[PDB]
């Protein structure tokens, strides 16, 4: 093969052992097989190249080929993209992916490509945040008085505020003790985090609020992409989608196993009606639609 291989490079914040890393490695292996060795992918994990914004910057300049980035994370640079991580806008992942393919999604992806040389190949489901507490939460009404810990993130703050709770920003490192001692009444995170940090050990209740649905977009530097042959483009396109279907199924399966596990562990799992939460988010939706000067959210919410 005088033409040699093409060794692409992929950066990620996540570390060996994680689902993101295992999916990246599956992507490396898939590309190498489907190309018969002509496309290889080198992985750089654990933020060895910087954080996600540093890595996107290396994509913009063609110094790095592939990275992950949340759809909503684009709102830092394309303000309307933030609509997709306002709480309760995405109902489930299929809905988030519908937004990615919609006229709105497509307009965000054309701006990503034109302004910053980012070509979004796919969106992969990466889990939904849920709510633990020291008392059961069976409707939005139980949220009143609830000292809910959140990270110091705008949308996490907004979920707790507009649900009626008492937002309590606090460093992740303090959370477990604050729960154990009822300095705080609850917190919110994906289920794997709840398991890994043993928050279920000091929280008797889990509520399936489904308030924040996450993804990871797979993004390739446009400078790389233009350099590639059309067959190589197709192998990459297909492999990313194939690995994303497996990624998405892995996350969904693990969530279902974890809810089952929590129930079997004596965690009390509730399922509040969510239209009351979507309705309680309206003030923020129309504020967002105003500061953007255009009805974005309601269209997205309807998809």
């Amino acid at each position, epitope marked *: 093969g005088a033409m040699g291989a093409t060794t692409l490079k992929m950066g990620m914040q996540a570390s060996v052992g994680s689902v993101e890393y295992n999916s990246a490695k599956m992507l490396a292996d898939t590309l190498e097989e489907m190309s018969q060795g002509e496309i290889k992918l080198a992985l750089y994990p654990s933020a060895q190249l910087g954080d996600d*914004r*540093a890595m*996107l*910057q290396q994509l*913009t*300049l063609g110094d790095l080929d592939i990275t992950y980035a949340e759809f909503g994370r684009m709102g*830092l*640079w394309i303000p309307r993209a933030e609509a997709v991580m306002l709480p309760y806008v995405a109902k489930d992942f299929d809905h988030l992916r519908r937004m990615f393919e919609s006229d709105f999604g497509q307009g965000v992806r054309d701006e990503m490509l*034109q*302004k*910053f*040389n980012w070509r979004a190949l796919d969106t992969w489901y990466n889990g939904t945040r849920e709510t633990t507490s020291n008392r059961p939460l069976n409707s939005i009404e139980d949220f009143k008085g609830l000292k809910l810990r959140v990270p110091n993130a705008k949308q996490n703050l907004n979920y707790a505020k507009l649900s009626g709770a008492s937002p309590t920003p606090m460093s992740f490192s303090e959370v477990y003790l604050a729960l154990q001692t009822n300095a705080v009444d609850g917190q919110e995170n994906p289920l794997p985090t709840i398991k890994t940090m043993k928050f279920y050990e000091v929280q008797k209740n889990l509520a399936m609020t489904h308030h924040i649905v996450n993804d990871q977009m797979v993004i390739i530097s446009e*400078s790389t992409w233009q350099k590639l042959s059309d067959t190589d483009k197709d192998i990459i396109q297909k492999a990313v989608q194939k690995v994303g279907d497996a990624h998405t199924q892995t996350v969904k399966t693990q969530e279902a196993e974890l809810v089952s596990f929590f129930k079997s562990e004596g965690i009390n799992v509730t399922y509040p009606d969510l239209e009351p939460f979507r309705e309680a988010m309206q003030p923020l939706y129309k504020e967002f639609d105003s500061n953007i000067g255009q009805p974005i959210v309601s269209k997205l919410a309807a998809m």
Partner: nanobody
């Protein structure tokens, strides 16, 4: 509206040192890469240097590296270009610019009006 104003242009010696400055206003400074460009009379607008949002990383044109030094003060909303060992070919209008990312495939979003530097001996 982010606005950028450049100061410090002079005429100066060949082999001389000159510090240019840029005052940025209008938005969270640290959300923006800051760049210096320059355009000489017969040539096209040309990249010179750029500095990342925190200053952790910087970028330089080949023609200027090792003797120019870009820096920023996120407390003062300033970016600076320390030019050492100037050379007649450095002569141009120098422009401050801002963007969310450093980019080579297009213009930065925002631009000052520029400051004239001339070096001759």
């Amino acid at each position: 509206q982010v606005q950028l104003v450049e100061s410090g242009g002079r005429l100066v010696q060949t082999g001389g040192s000159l510090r240019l400055s840029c005052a940025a206003s209008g938005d969270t400074f640290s959300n923006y890469v800051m760049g210096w460009f320059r355009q000489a009379p017969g040539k096209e607008r040309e990249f010179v240097a750029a500095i990342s949002w925190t200053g952790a990383n910087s970028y330089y044109a080949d023609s200027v590296a090792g003797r120019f030094t870009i820096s920023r003060d996120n407390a003062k909303n300033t970016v600076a270009l320390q030019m050492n060992s100037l050379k007649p070919e450095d002569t141009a209008i120098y422009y401050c610019a801002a963007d969310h990312f450093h980019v080579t495939h297009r213009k930065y979003d925002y631009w000052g009006q520029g400051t004239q530097v001339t070096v001759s001996s």
